Amino acid sequence: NNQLTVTNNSGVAQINAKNSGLYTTVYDTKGKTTNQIQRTLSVTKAATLGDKKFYLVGDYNTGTNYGWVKQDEVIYNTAKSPVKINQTYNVKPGVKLHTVPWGTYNQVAGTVSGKGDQTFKATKQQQIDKATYLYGTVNGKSGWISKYYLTA
Predict the structure, then answer these.
(1) Which of 13, 31, 11, 9 is nearest to 21 (CA)?
(2) What DSSP string runs through 21-43?
(3) What values do phi and psi take at 16, rounded to 5?
(4) How is the chain split into domains, by residue range?
């Protein structure tokens, strides 16, 4: 017996490169491969059709519905209330800025000069699963950067 128990969820996720695909419906049609093959966007919803855990992926910021996907093939990462510090640090030179929290191989906002510390003003922070990606501005670009990339 299976039943679509529809449930909400606040987090982010990326589906693996060697996936089945993205499930436009929970009953599925085909599950088609797309850009989300280690591209983090956001998780707006997460229901279970019986045992089958489907994570609804949405727009990076707004959470605009793109479709569901199986738990087997995803890396789901939780999120919490963001933090605000305006404390300006220097960013380590060579650091690659990421467009979305968790910041996978298909989320690059930019990169800093190999040798040359740039003034990174943080205006925001995001608490995602394990990693804390801060947000700020580096020479016209704006994006997320883990505290492990950022110099203290």
Answers:
(1) 31
(2) -BBSSSS-S--B--TTBT----E
(3) -75, 165
(4) 1-81, 82-152
